[PDB]
Amino acid sequence: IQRYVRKDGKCNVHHGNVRETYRYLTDIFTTLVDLKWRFNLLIFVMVYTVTWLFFGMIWWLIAYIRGDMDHIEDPSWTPCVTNLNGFVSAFLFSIETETTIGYGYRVITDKCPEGIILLLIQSVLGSIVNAFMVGCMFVKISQPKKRAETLVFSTHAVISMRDGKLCLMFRVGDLRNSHIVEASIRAKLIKSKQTSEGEFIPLNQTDINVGYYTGDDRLFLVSPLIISHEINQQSPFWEISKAQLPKEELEIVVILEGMVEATGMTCQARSSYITSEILWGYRFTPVLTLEDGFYEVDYNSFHETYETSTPSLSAKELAELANRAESN
Amino acid sequence: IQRYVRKDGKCNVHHGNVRETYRYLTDIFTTLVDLKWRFNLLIFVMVYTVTWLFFGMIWWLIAYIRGDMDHIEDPSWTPCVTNLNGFVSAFLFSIETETTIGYGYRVITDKCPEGIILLLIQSVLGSIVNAFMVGCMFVKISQPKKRAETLVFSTHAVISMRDGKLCLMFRVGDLRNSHIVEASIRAKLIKSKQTSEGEFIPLNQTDINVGYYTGDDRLFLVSPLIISHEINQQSPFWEISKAQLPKEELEIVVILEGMVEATGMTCQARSSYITSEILWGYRFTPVLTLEDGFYEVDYNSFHETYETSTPSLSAKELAELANRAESN
Amino acid sequence: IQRYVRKDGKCNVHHGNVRETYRYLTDIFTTLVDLKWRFNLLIFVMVYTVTWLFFGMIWWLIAYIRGDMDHIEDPSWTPCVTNLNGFVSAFLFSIETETTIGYGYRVITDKCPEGIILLLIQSVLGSIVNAFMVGCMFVKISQPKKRAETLVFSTHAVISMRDGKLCLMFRVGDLRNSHIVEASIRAKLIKSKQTSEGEFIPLNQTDINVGYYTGDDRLFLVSPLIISHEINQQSPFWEISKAQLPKEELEIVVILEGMVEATGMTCQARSSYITSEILWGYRFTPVLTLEDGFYEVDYNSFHETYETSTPSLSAKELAELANRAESN
Amino acid sequence: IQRYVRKDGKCNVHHGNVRETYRYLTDIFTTLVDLKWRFNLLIFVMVYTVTWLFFGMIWWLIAYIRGDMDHIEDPSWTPCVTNLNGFVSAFLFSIETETTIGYGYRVITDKCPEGIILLLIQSVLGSIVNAFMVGCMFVKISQPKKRAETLVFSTHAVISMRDGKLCLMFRVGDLRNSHIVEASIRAKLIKSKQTSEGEFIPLNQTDINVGYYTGDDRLFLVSPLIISHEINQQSPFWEISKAQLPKEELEIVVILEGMVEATGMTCQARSSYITSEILWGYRFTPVLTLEDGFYEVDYNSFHETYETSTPSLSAKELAELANRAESN
Ligand SMILES: [K+]
Ligand SMILES: [K+]
Ligand SMILES: [K+]
Ligand SMILES: [K+]
Ligand SMILES: [K+]
Ligand SMILES: [K+]
Ligand SMILES: [K+]
Ligand SMILES: [K+]
Ligand code: NA
Ligand code: NA
Ligand code: NA
Ligand code: NA
Questions:
Q1: Is A215 in the C-facing interface, judged by CB distances under 8 Å?
Q2: Which residues are annotated as site, described as Role in the control of polyamine-mediated channel gating and in the blocking by intracellular magnesium (chains A, B, C, D)?
């Protein structure tokens, strides 16, 4: 069985037999900005070209219906647009007006009522197309998920004693000098199970306590923080000894959410720990040192761990043995 | 009695005798973007045309007051704008300036102080109108409620045993490969009641526990999740047996909220279960399979349920019978 | 003593002797969009005019330094800009370029290196000014606080029995067919106090329970909801009888927060109840009726209350008397 | 040991040996808007100039390949662009088209297929560059962190009795007449520790209760509020007497988060109290007075404190002595 989430945060999941694809067009905006730049840069170019054409032919049709084509050199009659020499000239005008470059070689004149209301309709719809594409671009340029790129998770998780309690720990970092606002950490245990009743539940999610009851899950994340899950009665890890752990088949998905200081927008950084990435009996190497009026983070030690003396017993047995020690 | 919320999420409610309609114009922005596209495409066209007119007449009035109309072919005097042959020419200029196409057949000149400050006033207000409409368009194009279109809720809810407890379950899905960020699930029971004191409360809302005390209500929603409400003492469903359920007249409104990964914006997807859509003694069909390095969701099974052996007793009686079994 | 918050939500507070006014310019954006439209429409006009001037003189200075003014009619030499007849012509050009209308009577030419890099600098800064003002406009046009205009609070609060408990109730409404997303209700009791130690605390805020422990404070607000605060031991209202209430000097500030469905933006609607707006022994008139497949809200009854049989005793004494009734 | 956070909110932390600098370009948007204006104003100018060049040479290359340069004065043949006299003329045209000023001295004509699709490609990419830079500007102009500038924290924290309990108090303010929406206050104690097991934890963060269990941490912040942390068994301050405090080496980081009323965007204001900024046995001076129908805040007293009779004992000993007083 392969992991549900990769160490970089992408999920190993494919959505198949989605029969209502009608839905992807119902929010087209979302499908567009979700697309790869290649697809956006293409569509943008296509959308622009078809608008110039679709109006360039309408500019040519009205030019043909009015009878401007017939005489192209007479004093008395003036066409809707001066200088429209053929099949392509209307295309340049259609651009001069929608991009509003309007070189003024191709100029509108009074003769057709049909012309004025078109230039109007164009300019109006010329704003609606241009906006949509710019809008679409800005969003895609400014989307938060990119910030996740500079949010890092320690490569392993560790289990070791902390003031009498066995803790599952992982370390988290923000590489930017800016802040993740309303930052918070949650974590899900993913492992298959079967209920007494027989129901096999493929990749069952159960939330792991990492501060939610005390609000310690609400981070102030400048220098890297070790996030710590205390293995108590309620922990999924309560009955797991050093010796059992490798035989367990589970995955902890670790999820960091907050807002990009600059754009108020919320991002989500993810990582994952499969059973072979949890080191029993280890500790995270310090990364902080105080040099001349600033705290210096040595990211060379960010992922680094070291072994310490640690019980091999499950937290449950540790407790039981301690409660009897007290009780003697 | 008909449902408060339809399976697609729209609410069967009409607001009548709203006497302060003065309020809808106090936030006009909101009424506009809430309108149907037909109404936006109309207004946009109207707003543009009236600005060109309202300035086109001011351009004609100043042109008339200065005395430019009188002589249209003399060497010495130059008008505020070259080439203004009649009632319509000013309209083209009024467009050439606000859309800033400015074909340069119609060009401004120095003779009137009144002209320069107008072109200024126009351009300034020409930005304020254009912005407003673009702004209005982008919003309406980029609004989150559309994402809800690709968020799905299982067609039925089910009640069946799970590790000794009777649970009310429904299944939820996200059809897009992108993430709903800070996703969460809440659910309200809607049913009429009467207090001891006589007060009849038409469609009384009471929240249903679906993870809020443990933070299990905060979803990591990739492949579909069965959301599970354990029917305990506090549940509205505590004293409801298989046999009573059909006689009950209640509705569970199910509400999913989160942020569209791309635009940081929060959306809300809704669905509803009326009493005849809750299947007692059923289970959701698995939708997950593991094929060659990715988890495959078979959405053909998304809504599908199957019958399993299940007590017909209310959870309350189940508990009572179990507590006595233990007590023997 | 006058109320801290008015029934419409504005706060009766003035900030005086703010000595660091340096701060209002440090976030100028915020001061600008907070200003009245009159001040925005003014500034916008001023900012535009000064940019055209400040560049119009630079266009005239370079025109003077190069020696273009001296000869205005010679074949061999061409100026940086054709047709600059005097002190004002440069101003039109300065507009033709920043608004990018560029009528092409005033056209740039090759003779000056100093000219090309200016047109560049202008256009670049011409985008930075135009953006800022548009940006500033859109925000101010699209700000959420306006939505609050269509969020309503019942005019009175009521106290009366509900299933054995004395409750403080108020009613809340949303006049729009759209949704407030992640809507929620909180309420603060404001009243002066003095600690045992002597410390007089002018307008002390203490939060009033209206659903926060059960998540009932998270609204699904379609038709109007009666928000209900149960007066228990923890309530500020525990030792207040019908007879005491009028002598009490307190204010309940009621605060509704959520996101405008269309623009993801969060708004806050406020209202207030002073001691004389709390009716003891009343109930809210129903506003819901079911007519032909939709629920109809009759907003004529929204604020309306009616009297019902209700104990005159404080909830504390009610409890005490009930606990002794049980105990007999 | 120097403070982790300064009184103005900046953090004394440097990120060193960040080896994956590849990441800063992966979200370039974020690095750009995070930069100083000098760097933005520079880049903006550079990006614009290189686009005009990169297209100005392509306009010159096609002009050279077609054979327009060779003859610059002949009747029969027309170039792709009229009036391109040399190495610089193409640059003006490249500007006339991307800024869409298009003075119409330099005008496109029909002769080259290669020209039309370029003008198209330019205009299309001319929108993508202009958008990006405007977008980048608006964000940077409109970023919330600036609002923090008008959110203030009292200069000291105080410890003194309040209705029988020893409290750690600090005062917070909002200088603007506008509201911070969904405002909230949290606070972290930062102090080094060593676990029983030996593990030294450099600047250990533990959250301090300031209202989170009752929702009193959710502010309605008009006039300044004294935020109060009750020193109970769970408080880090439980075993700290007046006499010990100065010997303690700890820092309370105080964090205020909410949304700028106008732009829905979330900001975070920070301040810090090191051990020598906590005054034992003091109280905050009132800042509220009621003058003629509005509450007047006298910010001259905002930071001001005064001494009051206060026990010198740790809250723990205070409790113990009180519990024995009751027990006698
Ligand atoms: K909690
Ligand atoms: K909770
Ligand atoms: K809670
Ligand atoms: K233009
Ligand atoms: K133009
Ligand atoms: K032009
Ligand atoms: K022109
Ligand atoms: K809580
Ligand atoms: Na950081
Ligand atoms: Na998904
Ligand atoms: Na509503
Ligand atoms: Na304020």
A1: no
A2: 130
Please say whether the beta carbons of B207 and B8 come within 8 A.
Answer: no
Q: How many inter-chain contacts (B to D, CB under 8 Å) are there? A: 3
Q: Say which experimental method was used.
A: X-ray
Which amino acid does the sequence have at A66?
A: R
**What distance in Å separates the CA atoms of residue D15 and residue D20, rounded to the nearest whole number?**
12
The structural domains of chain B, ordered by start, are 1-13+144-328 (2.60.40.1400), 14-143 (1.10.287.70)
The whole-angstrom separation of Cα C225 and Cα C170 is: 8
The answer to whether residue A75 neighbours chain C at the CB level (below 8 Å) is no
CA dihedral D40, D41, D47, D48 (to 10 degrees): 150
Shortest distance, CA B196 to any CA of chain C (angstroms): 5
Residues whose CB is less than 8 angstroms from the CB of residue B79 and which lie 6 or more positions away in sequence, other chains included: B63, B66, B68, B109, B111
Provide the angle, in degrees to the nearest 10, between the axes of the packed helices B37-66 and B113-142.
Answer: 180
- Virtual torsion, Cα A35, A37, A39, A40, nearest 10 deg: 90
Helix H or strand E encompassing C284: strand C282-284
Alpha helices in A1-143 (DSSP H): 22-26, 28-34, 37-66, 89-98, 113-142
Go through A270-288 and write b for each residue having 16 or more CB atoms within 10 A of its CB, e for each that does not.
Answer: bbbbbbebbbbbbbbeebb
Q: Which of D111, D205, D256 to mutate to test the interface with A (most CBs of A within 10 A)?
A: D205
CA of residue B170 to ligand 11 center, whole Å = 25
Q: Do residues C315 and C321 touch, judged by C-beta distance below 8 A?
A: no
Instruction: Quote the Cα angle for D273-D276-D278, to 5°.
Output: 60
- Which chains are within 8 Å of B by 3+ CB pairs? A, C, D
Q: How many whole angstroms separate alpha carbon D270 and alpha carbon D253?
A: 7
Substitution target in B14, B191, B212, B252 with the highest count of C β-carbons within 10 Å is B14
Q: Contact at 8 Å (CB) between B136 and B33?
A: yes
Coil, strand, or helix at residue D233?
coil
Report how many Cβ contacts below 8 Å link chain B to chain C.
189
Closest CA to A196 of B285, B309, B171, B319: B309
The separation between the first and the last C-alpha atoms of chain C, rounded to the nearest angstrom, is 46
- Asked if D127 and A134 touch (Cβ cutoff 8 Å), the reply is yes
Please give the single-letter amino acid code of residue D130.
N
- Evaluate whether C272 touches B156 at the Cβ level (below 8 Å): no
Which residue among A141, A263, A308 sits closest to D132, beta carbon to beta carbon? A141
End-to-end CA distance of chain A: 46
Task: Tell me the nearest-neighbour CA distance from A190 into chain D, angstroms.
Answer: 28
Nearest Cβ partner for A297 among D15, D188, D206: D15
C-alpha distances (whole Å) from C201 to each of C5, D248, D285 are: 18, 30, 10
How many other CB atoms are there within 10 angstroms of residue B210's CB atom?
21
- Contact flag C263-B188 (C-beta cutoff 8 Å): no
Q: Read out DSSP for D86-123?
A: STTHHHHHHHHHHS----SSS-B-TT-HHHHHHHHHHH
CA–CA separation, A123 and A117 (whole Å)? 10
| Closest C-alpha to B250, from B261, B239, B259, B260 | B239
Question: Which token pair is C62?
Answer: 């370079």
**Is D30 an 8 Å CB contact of chain A?**
yes
Instruction: Spell out which residues of chain D touch residue B104, defining contact as CB-CB under 8 Å.
Output: 103-104
The residue in chain D having the minimum alpha-carbon distance to the alpha carbon of residue A179 is D268
Q: Which of residues 91-150 of B touch C (CB under 8 A)?
A: 96-97, 100, 102, 104, 107-108, 110, 116, 119-121, 123-124, 127-128, 131-132, 135, 139-140, 143-145
Determine the residue among D223, D227, D318 to mutate to test chain C binding: the one whose Cβ has the most chain C Cβ atoms within 10 Å: D223
Q: For chain B, how big is the Rg over CA atoms in Å?
A: 32
